[PDB]
């Protein structure tokens, strides 16, 4: 009933706060919307350094509203040359119900919330994911993410179509890290990743020996 406007949130550290739009799409009933923040380990955090307000609000039938995200002074203690990971959670609370013998289901949504410090602020539609490097390893690839951003890889195949529709175990690489991924060997690897907007561009890689980099 209560929908969220995005599949991930990027908090620009240049700002003190931002808002996420939510909508009660149900035109007959009011719903409460609970919002809260979890840290990179999925611990619920209530006193910062990122907070969501209000924790609960009521949305009348059809109403739109917002959740405000803001930072506490202790946000300064986070690294300032790379993103930090949080999760934004939205849970709806439906009313009643006053009917006998019912199972009631409430929807909850959990999305990634990337704290992006001011120093690594990005231009709109900037692309850093083409900086990924693929290492050929026994049974797959070790993907290096040298960027200061979390990178979510959702596809890896030998063709563009296979990068998009092939079966792949999603992996998110932390800033300046590397992770080994299971895969068939590909002569010309294609990789799909999720950008700030929530879309999935595809990148074409070229290999030399054990190392593949984005075809330039």
């Amino acid at each position: 009933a209560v929908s969220l406007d995005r599949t991930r949130a990027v908090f620009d550290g240049s700002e003190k706060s931002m808002t996420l739009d939510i909508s009660n799409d149900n035109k007959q009933l009011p719903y409460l919307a609970q919002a809260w923040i979890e840290n990179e380990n999925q611990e619920k955090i209530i006193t910062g350094p990122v907070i969501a307000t209000p924790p609960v609000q009521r949305l009348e039938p059809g109403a739109k509203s917002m959740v405000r995200l803001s930072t506490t002074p202790d946000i300064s203690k986070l690294p300032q040359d790379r993103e930090s990971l949080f999760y934004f959670n939205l849970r709806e609370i439906p009313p009643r119900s006053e009917k006998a013998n019912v199972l009631q289901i409430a929807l909850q949504t959990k999305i990634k919330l990337f704290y992006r410090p001011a120093a690594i602020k990005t231009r709109p539609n900037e692309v850093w994911q083409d900086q990924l490097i693929l290492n050929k390893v026994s049974g797959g690839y070790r993907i290096e993410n040298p960027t200061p951003y979390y990178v979510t890889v959702i596809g890896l195949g030998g063709s563009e179509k296979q990068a998009e529709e092939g079966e792949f175990e999603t992996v998110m690489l932390s800033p300046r890290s590397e992770q080994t991924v299971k895969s068939a060997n590909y002569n010309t690897p294609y990789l799909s990743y999720i950008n700030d907007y929530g879309g999935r561009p595809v990148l074409s890689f070229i290999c030399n020996g054990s190392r593949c980099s984005v075809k330039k």
Binding site: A1, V102, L103, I105, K112, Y197, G198
Partner: protein, 128 residues
């Protein structure tokens, strides 16, 4: 329309209320009811759907996910025909797909009891 600023998925707006009717002319244990919702995505997507138990079950159902409905009764809650508490749906392109939540009543006889049934679960959508 300013490039909707963000790609999103939105579930169907209807109240998720799985109704088992009057349990009087069938007053049943293996009783089944369901609710289908849809989810519309602007972008490709994976969504991992995970049922969260709110009200605790009276019986143990092993690896089947359940919720207590009160008195002697439990519901085994399925999602897209899976009793195990989790499913993932995938969108290669923008579009909408259905997700069906099913409820199958379970009650013993020893533990049973006469009154009205009421239960709740949370369907958690985890987006990568």
């Amino acid at each position: 329309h300013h490039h909707h600023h963000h790609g999103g998925c939105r579930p169907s707006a209807q109240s998720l209320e799985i109704k088992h009717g009057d349990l009087s002319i069938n007053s049943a244990n293996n009783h089944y009811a369901a609710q289908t919702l849809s989810v519309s995505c602007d972008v490709p997507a994976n969504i991992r759907f995970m049922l969260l138990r709110n009200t605790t079950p009276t019986y143990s159902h092993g690896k089947k996910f359940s919720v207590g409905l009160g008195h002697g009764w439990d519901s085994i809650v399925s999602v897209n025909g899976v009793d195990t508490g989790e499913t993932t749906m995938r969108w290669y392109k923008a579009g909408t797909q259905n997700l069906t939540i099913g409820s199958r009543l379970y009650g013993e006889s020893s533990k049973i009891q006469p009154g009205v049934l009421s239960g709740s679960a949370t369907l958690l959508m985890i987006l990568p």
